[PDB]
């Protein structure tokens, strides 16, 4: 074999227009390439101009989302539990009773 | 690092006071070395633990 | 899906396939059968 | 994509041309179906142009963009860094490369 | 023959029983607490008498 990208890129689709393949699908049904190994999605509007062989890799629609980690507490994080208000006004309210 | 420096000043208090039997004072300041010494040992533990947690 | 080698009916069936995949029969039909008539919730 | 499709705090987003959109816009399932209501008239558009555009936007969101693409695309950006995204759920379709 | 287009995939997969909950612990009233703070406990106690 000779490897030979793809020259415009696009991996497989009708114009719908001028009904004229453009990527690998059409650089296989118009006589330019013979064999196409690449992440080629099957679909039914490309069966019914090549014949795909069998899946060499299952894969889906899946969601992705940035990667978590730890919140690292502040060290100060157990006067939390209490607004900042009321922490000032329990000493204020101390300083009273006394 | 500072409680090894602290240990090892009371270490010296320690010894100073058994050639100047005189001053009563070089053996309290033995005791609060250890003491201060072994303080800073747990902010050393929690430090340690804590920074190597995040 | 599997039938004799050189039957007429290969191909008709590998498109039929397919095009229940895209519109979504595949899906909704083991969903039907595995968690729609589950038992446990 | 059920636990998404109820929040409205991090947003979703296909990319404009391709078939992570199609997939969605013709779905019959209703867990789907409104998430495309929602995804077709929301605002800013969701809707990316590029694969590493979508990328990025994730990964420059602060965990508000979740990004739907392949699984082979999603794993292959997941073990490569900078390492701020992962993969989370399962496939929501079933397709292969032949 | 000449099989078709995979209408379903799918793979060797692990199964198991669901967790049942879980058996207690002797010296599980100890849990809330990590074994650090419960260490560190100690030697506060230790230092402040
Ligand atoms: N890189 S991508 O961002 O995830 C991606 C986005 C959009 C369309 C893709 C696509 C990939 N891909 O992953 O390899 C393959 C592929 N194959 C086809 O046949 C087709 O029509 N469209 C596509």
Redesign the interface.
């Known amino acids: 074999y000779k490897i030979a990208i793809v020259p415009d890129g696009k991996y497989g689709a009708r114009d719908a227009d001028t009904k004229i393949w453009n990527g690998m699908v059409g650089e296989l049904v118009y006589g330019k390439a013979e064999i196409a190994i690449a992440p080629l999605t099957i679909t039914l509007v490309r069966e019914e101009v090549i014949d795909f062989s069998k899946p060499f890799m299952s894969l889906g629609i899946s969601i992705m989302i940035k990667k978590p980690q730890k919140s690292k507490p502040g060290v100060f994080s157990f006067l939390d539990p209490l607004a900042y208000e009321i922490w000032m006004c329990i000493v204020f309210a101390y300083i009273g009773v006394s | 690092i500072l409680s090894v420096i602290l240990l090892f000043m009371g270490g010296l208090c320690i010894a100073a006071s058994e050639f100047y039997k005189t001053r009563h004072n070089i053996i309290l300041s033995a005791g609060i070395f250890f003491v201060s010494a072994?303080?800073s040992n747990?902010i050393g533990?929690?430090v340690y633990?804590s920074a190597n947690?995040? | 899906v599997a039938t004799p080698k050189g039957s007429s009916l290969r191909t008709p069936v590998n498109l039929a396939v397919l095009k229940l995949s895209e519109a979504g029969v595949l899906d909704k039909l083991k969903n039907k059968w595995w968690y729609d008539k589950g038992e446990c919730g | 994509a059920e636990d998404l499709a109820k929040q409205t705090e991090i947003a979703y987003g296909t990319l404009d041309s391709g078939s992570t959109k199609e997939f969605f816009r013709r779905s019959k399932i209703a867990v789907y179906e409104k998430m495309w209501t929602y995804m077709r008239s929301a605002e800013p558009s969701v809707f990316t142009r590029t694969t590493a555009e979508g990328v990025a936007r994730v990964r420059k969101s602060k965990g508000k963009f979740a990004f739907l693409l392949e699984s082979t695309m999603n794993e292959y950006i997941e073990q490569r860094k900078p390492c701020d995204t992962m993969k989370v759920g399962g496939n929501l379709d079933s397709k292969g490369y032949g």
């Open positions: 072994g303080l747990i533990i929690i633990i947690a995040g």
